[PDB]
Design a protein around this ligand. Sequence first.
Ligand code: MG
Ligand code: MG
Ligand code: MG
Ligand code: MG
Lengths: 63, 136, 386, 225
Amino acid sequence: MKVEIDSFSGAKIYPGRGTLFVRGDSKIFRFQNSKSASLFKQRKNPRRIAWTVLFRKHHKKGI
Amino acid sequence: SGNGAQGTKFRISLGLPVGAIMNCADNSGARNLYIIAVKGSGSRLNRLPAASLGDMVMATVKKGKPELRKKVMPAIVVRQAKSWRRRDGVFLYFEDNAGVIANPKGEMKGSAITGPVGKECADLWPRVASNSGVVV
Amino acid sequence: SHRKYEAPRHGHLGFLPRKRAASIRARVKAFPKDDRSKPVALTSFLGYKAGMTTIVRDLDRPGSKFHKREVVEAVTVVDTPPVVVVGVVGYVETPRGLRSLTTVWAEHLSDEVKRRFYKNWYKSKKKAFTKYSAKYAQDGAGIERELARIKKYASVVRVLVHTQIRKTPLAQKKAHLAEIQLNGGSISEKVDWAREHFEKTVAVDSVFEQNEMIDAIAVTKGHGFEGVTHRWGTKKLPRKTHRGLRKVACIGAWHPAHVMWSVARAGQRGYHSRTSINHKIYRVGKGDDEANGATSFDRTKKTITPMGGFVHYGEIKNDFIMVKGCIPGNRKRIVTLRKSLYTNTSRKALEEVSLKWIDTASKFGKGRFQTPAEKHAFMGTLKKDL
Amino acid sequence: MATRTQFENSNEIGVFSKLTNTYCLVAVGGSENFYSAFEAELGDAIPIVHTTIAGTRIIGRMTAGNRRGLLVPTQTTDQELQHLRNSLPDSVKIQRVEERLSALGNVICCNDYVALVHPDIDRETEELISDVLGVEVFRQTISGNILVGSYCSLSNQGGLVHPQTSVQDQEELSSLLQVPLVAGTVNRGSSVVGAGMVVNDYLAVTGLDTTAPELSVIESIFRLQ
RNA sequence: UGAACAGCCUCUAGUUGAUAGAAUAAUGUAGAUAAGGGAAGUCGGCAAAAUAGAUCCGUAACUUCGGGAUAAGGAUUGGC
RNA sequence: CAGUCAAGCGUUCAUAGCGACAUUGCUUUUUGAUUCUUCGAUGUCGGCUCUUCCUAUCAUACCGAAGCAGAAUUCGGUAAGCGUUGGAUUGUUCACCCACUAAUAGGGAACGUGAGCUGGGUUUAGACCGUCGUGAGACAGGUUAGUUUUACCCUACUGAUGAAUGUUACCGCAAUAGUAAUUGAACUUAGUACGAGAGGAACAGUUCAUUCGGAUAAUUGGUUUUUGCGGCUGUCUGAUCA
Ligand SMILES: [Mg+2]
Ligand SMILES: [Mg+2]
Ligand SMILES: [Mg+2]
Ligand SMILES: [Mg+2]
């Protein structure tokens, strides 16, 4: 199997878990759950959502 | 589908009933396709015949070029936008409903496809896979 | 006049009446056909439904489009402690059917099985099978005359067995007792096997093995009184309907001047005994073993229990059967697993199955992690961890 | 020979197969006649690999191949990649491409020396093609057809292009590729020539409905005699 | 608060009256939400949804020249 | 709706398929005829919903015949097990087109079914037009608006208890009753059999799908009084916190 990464939060996606979304510019996004999927559809920036890997990498928290 | 099927297809969750309008992905000059029928659909009282990705439908061009309007022609669904499950269990969906024009044997009226197509459609129709830019 | 448009009948007439089951343990109405050539073995087993999970396996179907490709499938887990053999019974065959003639019990009966013979256990002198054990502890006098009676008569031998409810996380303390048919050897060999196995435990791998198609017999989940729309699946009446719309409009013609039995009506939904056939065993797990949830490809030592335990059930410290798909009944319910009544080839019942990965994430939410070590490695250190 | 073959009824052989000088790739769900054509014509000198790319029977439109290298999309699994690594000779290099257009047979029309690509590919993918295939690259369209792999059939000796192609585009592409090009049809008039057939230095395989003048044009432009 | 004797909350004053208790089946009455499609339902878009204040831009055919007109159609709005 | 007869048709040849002139029937989904029952009232159109029955079988199963070479088709037998659709117009039944499908067969059950619905039509009282009439008014002529009541009783049906079989508990047997699965596509057989060619099968095998049914909730989606967490408006608790 392959363990994919969340396109919004960077969480690990196990097989059969979450959803996938193909945008009209032929780019693939993978969501581990409906929470990150709905934040993506609400167009929030993952650099400003405090629990994401990209936020913690930006803010040097636990790095 | 029916006649021009290259192999079989697993059941995809039906997302396009009769009366649905989808974008027309090819370069044949048509803008949208209006679904009036699904090939191979069964019979149940009050149930609308619905289409999924890779299905061949009967459609009319509601908006587009006048030599394409006001007649029925076969079409092939290439983008579904209703989420369906594969046998590897990913749930996936596009962001719009889209199809292309074809004859009853399945070869495309147009020549190029804009945007992605599904692999369940590209495996089933080789001309769509031939003119398709990206297959996901 | 005739019905204007044809449509199939709502519901199945062969599952009637849709009433509550007589007991919470469903009856095994038929056992596999005996042949007197195989060794003496049980035909079924008892377990408790624990819950469901997913696996990933590589499909082997030579001709499918998903041949030699990974698929993810839903399996359900049945917790099976080793069952305890107490008692055998023989059945002679009469022109009015099968009839039991004697029952010979084991000597020492445990408290969890003799709680089955009581409604108020806490106020009792516990006098059960005391004079029967007094019939024992002679040499043999009142014992092998009944055993030789079962040998001389009794064309069908069945074994009384009982679960070990105290090994499970259930709070019941009162074991389930059942009859399981023996399907090997002659009548004398059957009763000799039973006599040797009195007061002894039989494990689940002695009766089941991998890639075996089995049947699940259980009572379904109860739902109480239900309207006709969800109980039978009839069409909802339109919105501007006076006096309600979750109904059936015409419940019969003028003649015959009675409501027919075939008309769908409201009543009890669920809690019916069902037998679902052709479920493939993917794993016969051992409870005396770590890395139950590990495969040859995963190879991380984790048990089959998910994070936080099975929801509403608990732990799987005993042996278990991983079986493909859905079985009737909800969690914490007794379920009888039975061998197949026929030999199925089908190129699907003969498929050899080797698992790749078993899901052990939490079912009490959107679990991200399979093991607490993996969760700690991903999240780093926290405030509570110093 | 332009060999008449069908893929279970399909007269498009370039969709289901990829033929180079050094190797051949065929789909796993193929008929005995379809395998027997490549086995008889290619012989034992050239390996034929039954492969699946990204879970799809279509492999010719998914992959772009060369005698020096093979390009596969991102969606190709590790089992398929390892099977291709074992089955293929050590000379060829197999490298995954991470690019949005992701259907490399449609995107790329290539031979041993020179390649035509889709105009809008990424620069990293262009450099990856130039590295792995060792092939100089041009971004060009065939009379406005962006899918140069589907709308051109190319070999070392010559090339077949789209029938509705401007003549000026024909000498421009011929001078750019240093091979003679002919506008023609395959499979009783189907426009998609690269999807219609596969060709290499000594073999061309086409659909059964490809007519005799079309087959004569094929053998003339590819010099298979 | 707000344009406002609108709606919502409060002060003075006045009530705390309308048989109650326990459970939460079906079918109701009243209030709601729904993936994908969007009137295919129906005699008929019945019912519901959508729109909504204010500022700026822009506004057709026709006309009894007064209108149509908030036509249609766009953009903005907090706190400091 | 079905017989019988056989002048003819069918190249030739009554009867493969038909069949004139005659003549014997069956049916009660037509319309009449009659007036028996009901006028101290049996709710009179159509549709929606739902069950069952009939066979005079549209499809599916197995067969017989051909003016059956193959493919397609036609006639007939056992057969009612199983299915028989989505729409535009019209209040309609009916009809007529579009389209899918294996097929879109015909009917009954107080012209099934209004204390099941609806109320478009018809069929009150308002109103307009045309024709007729001096007029009041008339018109199976056209148009528009027009209150659809009651079950808590008995039976039936669906589910639920329960006295009495010395008491109580556990494990069972099985009389009787019900019953369920259905249809298609693709690959291959095979461009094979057959045929002069055009054309072009079938059995076995494999992978899927349609309709139906019984469960189930690992995953995905829906639902939110977990009023669980966060945010936001207005007001009130002097502010802050809450
Ligand atoms: Mg209807
Ligand atoms: Mg009727
Ligand atoms: Mg009927
Ligand atoms: Mg859960």
